[PDB]
Nucleic acid binder design. Structure first.
Lengths: 214, 41, 69, 427
RNA sequence: AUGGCCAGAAAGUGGUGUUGACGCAAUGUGAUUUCGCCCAGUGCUCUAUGUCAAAGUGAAGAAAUUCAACCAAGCGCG
RNA sequence: AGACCCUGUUGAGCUUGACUCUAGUUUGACAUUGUGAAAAGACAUAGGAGGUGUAGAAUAGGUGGGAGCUUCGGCGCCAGUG
RNA sequence: GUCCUAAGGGGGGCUCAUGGAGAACAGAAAUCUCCAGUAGAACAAAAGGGUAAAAGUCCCCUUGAUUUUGAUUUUUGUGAAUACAAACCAUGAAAGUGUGGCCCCUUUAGUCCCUCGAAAUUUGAGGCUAGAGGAAGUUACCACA
């Protein structure tokens, strides 16, 4: 797949998203990948994370589930947070845990509380695939939120189809292109046959016609 | 494994009841009745 | 008749080449049957040209074992 | 019931013959045969009717998958299970599902749902039928994986290190343990495991035999281990059974090892490991009891290493000086497991060469709860860039992920360079 | 009977046969009187998926060639 | 120089799913083999239509976005049920 | 199918198993102190050989568990062990010590490796070099030497 073709594909994608037809919100540039010659169940389900150089979804909300010191750091940094008292007041209600999982796309928990998160919130976060990322009391929480925002996840499931968010319309062309190669190269590196198992590639915004890389 | 000792030491197996000693005598027996299937002459 | 060959018979039975094969094994004879029917064939020694025994018969050894307890 | 046996099997065979001659339909034949199958007292009649039903399904789905017929029969079996839980008539549907699954005629998630209803039942025979369906298919999956694999001094030390690196690569990309297609095809595995554990294992009023409770426990623990579920009361339930006096305690320990995984907290596994250490490895304990306990502890530490404290780990590793070979090998297995995983708890005497070299040079990092691999770049991408720079320098004499797309030959070269770097680090 | 069982290197060849089921051919048992069950296995015999040769077909290549389906009888199944 | 025992680079008769072959027989293809009709099958495409175990307003293949789309009537998000 | 087939080098400090006498709970056994203690401990031979300011144990640095060329022994090539020769190193104040652990087919690769013999290019093949893997009985019908 030619890189000039990549840059021109994202060129008409940004052109259509920003000039021809613009929605009322910030559309998200996303990559959809098919798979072939690969077993979903009898083989390994590959899992991996890679940080994009630029934040793909700046509107994503991240909750903080930590100690009082981390709550003070979060309210200093302007990040919403919840406490172990709040988790106890939820009282292991599946509906409330589902509402929290739907409301917050990502969670960051302190090292002292991450070993009690599956005790307090049951299996809800693991079911939603939103198990929190540990943070120590010495690490910078703003930086932690930065790689949590910049990271994407590549897990196999029961089907041979995947979809990831590689940026938004609002960022510029070259860093969009950089996000695209890091995502594609990381996926090819995770794939055990590399390019031989890749079915097809597709890039689009939230509401845009598809552009086929492959 | 081809060695044949005069006496074989029993091997303890965990999660199973202990075997009876070698000098234990078992007096339980079952009996079956022999029947001749012929009518009166 | 390729299908009546013993190789094809063992492949259709499932027994893999490399497994032990007793001499004389066919469709009618299994290994247990050969071991049973060779009992009626045992009882002969192996001799040289001059008539002396060079390999003993079955249960006819000539060796004195070490009988210790 | 009242006909002669030979006449009645002749009537069944003649109905199957008329189906073969296409006089009657498969649905009509099956609706004739199935109530007689579930209600007949004759064992030979039931066996032949079951054989004819299996043959009819095989002949129908041989040329093409008959989705309508499969759906109707699956619905009929599901209704048979749903009508009466306490009845023993569901074992026929269980046996039919096993036979069609092993013949690979049915591969949909609907047989898995039917056998899920079989597991969630009151009758012990249909419960263990569903449990055997979800469990004993692991052997069939292993056979299928074997078929797929069939289809697919210093120099000696370097070769041994390369073999170890190849074994590590096989562990990285090998089929996962405790894996089965039906187990993956179960919808709501957490809900299924919770219902099974609350229905059969928790209930003291259940009069199930110990082997059947162990089958249900094997199902629950394999579900939890495979799908990474979090079922906290199961670990507290294991506490009574973690005793050497318990029958099939080896099966219980294997179940607990299957139940443990990475996302399980160390807070719940550690009392179990402490209890196994107290009851199993001690001064008055037998050698076989100590070896079994240390093997179970090694398996639990394999699934989750953070359960154990450093003092307990050093105490258990010091059992390698024991005169019993089994206890010695179990302690050495635990020591080697923590050597690759987390050598910092291990003593400086017992860490080994590679562990001490890694800890001194700073490559080895502490393993913590919840940590996930977060490689910002591809593995070996720096080595691939160095190789590309060397090639450019050679061409002149005669960033990689940022600009250039990954060629497959370049990816193979990067994998070879990563393997060479791993071999050099091992050497 | 455009047949069954045989002969013959072949034949526009021959035996049964100048024959036609009260016959020809292959067997076992062996005057007269008296005298069940099982198709388990091995034989024999009847009726869409598996196994599936040569020829033929499709694809790749510059070709040699390679890979795929299709695949009669027999075997398996009943 | 018989009969008997023992030995063989032993010979020969016979038997059998022992090995390698073969007469005969059976099946398929090409040719002998000409003049005409009617059918189907398999691919190739040019397309089109579909999804109930229960609960849910409906009849949920799945995946990823997504709180806004909008033909301006609404569909949405929210809530409910999974 | 899982598990085990063993951490080597340098320097420094200290003695082990066990017995006797003592110390709240503490007793046969938990920790502490002294005396006696030729190895009765440990060192990956369960009653072999050898080791006490060590070959044991702990601490601090390290990977001589590294390349290259010959010689010897077990005996063409190996493998193992033994003293070295050259380089690069480690450790210690240094002498020194350390080159490990007390003792015939199949298939892959070769840029500048050689042939396919009228010449050349490309597939393919061969060679050489360096690797990886692994055909039954019976004879009381008989016959011969």
């Amino acid at each position: 797949i030619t890189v000039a073709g990549v840059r021109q594909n994202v060129a008409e994608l940004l052109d259509y998203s920003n000039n021809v037809k613009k929605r009322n919100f910030l559309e998200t540039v996303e990559l959809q990948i098919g798979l072939k010659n690969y077993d979903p169940q009898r083989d390994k389900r590959f899992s991996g994370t890679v940080k994009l150089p630029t934040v793909p979804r700046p509107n994503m909300s991240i909750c903080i589930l930590g100690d009082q010191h981390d709550i003070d750091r979060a309210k200093h940094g302007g990040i919403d947070a919840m406490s172990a008292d709040d988790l106890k007041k939820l009282n292991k209600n599946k509906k409330l845990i589902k509402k929290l999982a739907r409301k917050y796309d990502a969670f960051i928990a302190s090292e002292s509380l991450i070993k009690q998160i599956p005790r307090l919130l049951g299996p809800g976060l693991s079911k939603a695939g939103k198990f929190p990322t540990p943070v120590s009391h010495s690490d910078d929480l703003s930086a932690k939120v930065n790689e949590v925002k910049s990271t994407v996840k590549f897990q196999l499931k029961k089907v041979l189809c995947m979809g990831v968010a590689v940026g938004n319309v609002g960022m510029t062309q070259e860093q969009l292109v950089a996000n695209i190669m890091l995502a594609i190269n990381y996926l090819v590196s995770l794939l055990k046959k590399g390019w031989q198992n890749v079915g097809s590639l597709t890039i689009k915004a939230t509401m845009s016609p598809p552009k086929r890389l492959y | 494994k081809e060695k044949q000792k005069d006496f074989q030491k029993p091997k303890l197996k965990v999660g199973k009841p202990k075997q009876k000693p070698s000098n234990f005598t078992d007096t339980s027996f079952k009996t079956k009745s022999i029947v001749v299937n012929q009518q009166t002459l | 008749g390729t299908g009546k060959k013993e190789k094809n018979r063992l492949l259709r039975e499932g027994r893999t080449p490399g497994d032990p094969h007793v001499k004389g094994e066919n469709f009618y004879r299994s290994a247990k049957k050969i071991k049973t029917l060779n009992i009626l064939k045992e009882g002969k020694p192996i001799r040289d040209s001059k008539g002396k025994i060079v390999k003993a018969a079955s249960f006819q050894s000539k060796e004195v074992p070490k009988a210790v307890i | 019931t009242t006909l002669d046996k030979d006449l009645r099997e002749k009537v069944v065979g003649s109905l199957v013959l008329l189906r073969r001659k296409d006089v009657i339909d498969s649905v009509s034949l099956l609706t004739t045969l199935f109530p007689i199958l579930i209600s007949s007292p004759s064992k030979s009649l039931r066996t032949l009717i079951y054989t004819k039903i299996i043959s009819d399904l095989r002949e129908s789905n041989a040329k093409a998958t008959n989705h309508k017929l499969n759906r109707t029969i699956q619905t009929v079996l599901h209704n048979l299970l749903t009508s009466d839980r306490t009845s023993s008539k569901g074992l026929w549907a269980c046996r039919i599902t096993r036979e069609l699954w092993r013949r690979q005629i049915w591969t949909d998630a609907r047989p898995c749902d039917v056998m899920k209803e079989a597991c969630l039942s009151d009758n012990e025979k249909v419960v263990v039928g569903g449990c055997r369906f979800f469990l004993g298919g692991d052997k069939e999956r292993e056979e299928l994986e074997d078929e797929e694999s069939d289809e697919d001094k210093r120099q000696k030390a370097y070769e041994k290190a390369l073999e170890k690196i190849k074994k590590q690569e096989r562990k990285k990309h090998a089929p996962h343990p405790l894996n089965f297609s039906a187990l993956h095809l179960i919808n709501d595995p957490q809900g299924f495991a919770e219902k099974l554990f609350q229905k059969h294992l928790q209930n003291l009023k259940n009069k199930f035999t110990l082997e059947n409770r162990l089958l249900v426990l094997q199902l629950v623990t394999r579900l939890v281990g495979l799908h990474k579920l979090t079922v906290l009361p199961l670990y507290s339930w294991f506490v009574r059974y973690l005793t050497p006096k318990q029958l099939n305690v080896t099966t219980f320990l294997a179940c607990l090892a299957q139940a443990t995984h990475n996302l399980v907290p160390p807070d719940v596994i550690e009392p179990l490991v402490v209890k196994i250490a107290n009851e199993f490895v001690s001064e008055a304990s037998a050698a076989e009891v100590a070896a079994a306990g240390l093997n179970a502890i090694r398996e639990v530490a394999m699934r989750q290493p953070l359960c154990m404290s450093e003092t307990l780990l050093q105490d258990l590793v010091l059992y390698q000086k024991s005169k019993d070979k089994g206890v010695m090998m179990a302690a050495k297995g635990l020591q080697s497991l923590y050597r690759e995983v987390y050598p910092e708890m291990l003593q400086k005497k017992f860490r080994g060469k590679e562990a001490t070299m890694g800890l001194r040079a700073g490559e080895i990092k502490p393993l913590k709860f919840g940590e996930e691999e977060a490689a910002e770049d591809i593995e070996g991408i720096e080595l691939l860039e160095k190789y590309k720079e060397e090639q450019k320098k050679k061409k002149v004499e005669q960033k990689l992920a940022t600009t250039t797309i990954l060629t497959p030959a370049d990816l193979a070269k990067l994998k070879e360079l990563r393997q060479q770097a791993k071999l050099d680090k091992m050497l």
